[PDB]
Amino acid sequence: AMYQQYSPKDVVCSWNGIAIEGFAPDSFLRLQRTSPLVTPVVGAGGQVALTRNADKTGTIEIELMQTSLSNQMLSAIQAKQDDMELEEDISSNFVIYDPSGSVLATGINAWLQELPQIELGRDQNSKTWIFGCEKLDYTSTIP
Amino acid sequence: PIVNVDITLNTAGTTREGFGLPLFLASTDNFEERIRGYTSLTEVAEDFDESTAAYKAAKQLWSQTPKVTQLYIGRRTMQYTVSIPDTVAEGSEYSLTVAIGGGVSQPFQYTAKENDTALIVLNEFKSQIEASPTIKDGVNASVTGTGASATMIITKAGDNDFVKVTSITPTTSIAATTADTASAALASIETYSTDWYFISAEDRTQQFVLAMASEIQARKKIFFTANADVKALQGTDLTSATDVPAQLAKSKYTRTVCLWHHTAEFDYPEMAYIAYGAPYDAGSIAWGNAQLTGVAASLQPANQRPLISIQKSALDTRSCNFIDLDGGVPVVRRGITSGGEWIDIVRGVDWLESDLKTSLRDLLINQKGGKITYDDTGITRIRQVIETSLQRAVNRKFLSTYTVTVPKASQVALADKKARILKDITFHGILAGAILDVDLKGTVA
């Protein structure tokens, strides 16, 4: 009859031991796998053979308010990570706590990919951070 | 000098850092402290001679392809029983030199003569020691003697934890024996440091080994031991066997590893087995099919030939370890602890804890600027760090999957929030096995 309520104030995203707080007014999280699950190859005679793709990589895009503090805590993290050697790990699990079940995925071995594009104006423009993933696991409540 | 170049004719050795460091509880008071670390065999040789058990264990440890960064040597509290068997005037009957802790020596001189028996001279030595004001505070004396026998037992009394009464000259018939159970030795060792993982002991008595394993099982460390009891090879029914390797299996001590080798007592081969997996990251290694350099197969006590299949079956039934001879290559087999648990599984479980503890301590210490509020955000950060540690475990090919369940902020009682503590977090993991044996068939037609 009625599905679960979706409260965006209860959604908490945490990466690298810090919590990313302060979300853009309109859209603040986007998870997408870089490749489809299967790609069917249709022969000239009409026969179909599936090709089950082996790439589970996804990209996580998160938007924060222009003046949010997290924007200046991820910048410091990125600056510290740049100075690191190659042998040190620069990735950690991207954890999303959503009691509504609206989100399905947790980023496995997520890493920072793109810095936000800074834009200033008479109005406020959000900053869009982009994260990678090793395997964007879609979990389910149903066992 | 612009370029300082030194060329030596010594072969290069490789040192690797793994999880855990070995500790060897000896029975020698060469040093005054309880635990002293050594970084090579040469450093061990500076305080120990080639005939000491500690030097033998160190030599066995450092005969592997990696090096094992450091080795800790533990000292047991040892008592002394001074005897006399002679009783002849004064001559010298002296030079006891009860050292005691701190650094005092206060040696001893010729006690007496004139119809004086070992009882009289030993009682005089006890009285002289009690008279001196640098040793009576921390050293206790007890002249049981019981007539001619004349047993003069000395031991540490108070704060002074070091006692050494070595005496030159045939005049004094000193002895040196350990006077602590497994509990006393372990408590004394842990009072000094607790950053060691592998533990092995010089003492090979059945009672001490059994108690030591019993007390290790309650802790987060692994006890490595060796044995050369023939009765271990004879029986196959467990209830029937009552030797050291047997009761360990009977008691199900998952935290002890027993390796049956014919060179027990005299030598300590389990140190090489420790060094096999010590310098490698815990969980990613398979302790089963191990090749040890310089260690021969488990020879038979009588004919000095490798064991027959029946004896190996008996040892397997006792959940021990033996150095099998596969086609002429001496390989440690079954890599298992007394109790059926794989060594790598136990070490990996201990390492996971050490890693979860380290990661959460890193999160919870570096919060100098502010605080981690008890709302959902703090719980989410803690859960993320836990999941990161578990993913570190998975990437090592120790685990396969994992689930983490954390409580909501509204389901935590006020009693907990007051004590600023977070409880009842649960996580699960699924291991990934390793292959150690192959089953084969054949047709040929």
Residue numbers in the entry:
A (entry chain B): 2 to 144
B (entry chain A): 4 to 448
Kindly provide excerpts from the paper associated with this entry.
Bacteriophage Sf14 infects the human pathogen Shigella flexneri. Here, we report multiple high-resolution structures of the full Sf14 particle, including symmetric and asymmetric reconstructions of the virion capsid, empty capsid, portal region, tail, and baseplate. Sf14 virions have a spherical icosahedral capsid of 820 Å in diameter, which is connected to a long, contractile tail that is approximately 1205 Å long and an average of 235 Å in diameter, expanding to 315 Å at the baseplate. Overall, phage Sf14 appears to share some similarities to other model phages, but in different combinations: both λ- and T4-like decoration proteins, HK97-like capsid and portal proteins, T4/Mu-like tail fibers, a Mu-like baseplate, and a P2-like tail needle.
Here we determined the full structure of the uncontracted, pre-ejection tail, including the tail fiber proteins, baseplate, and central tail needle. A helical reconstruction of the tail is shown in Fig. 6A, with cross-sections showing poorly resolved density in the central tube that could be attributed to tape measure proteins and/or genomic DNA. Dimers of the tail sheath and tube proteins (gp39 and gp40) that comprise the helix were also determined by ModelAngelo.
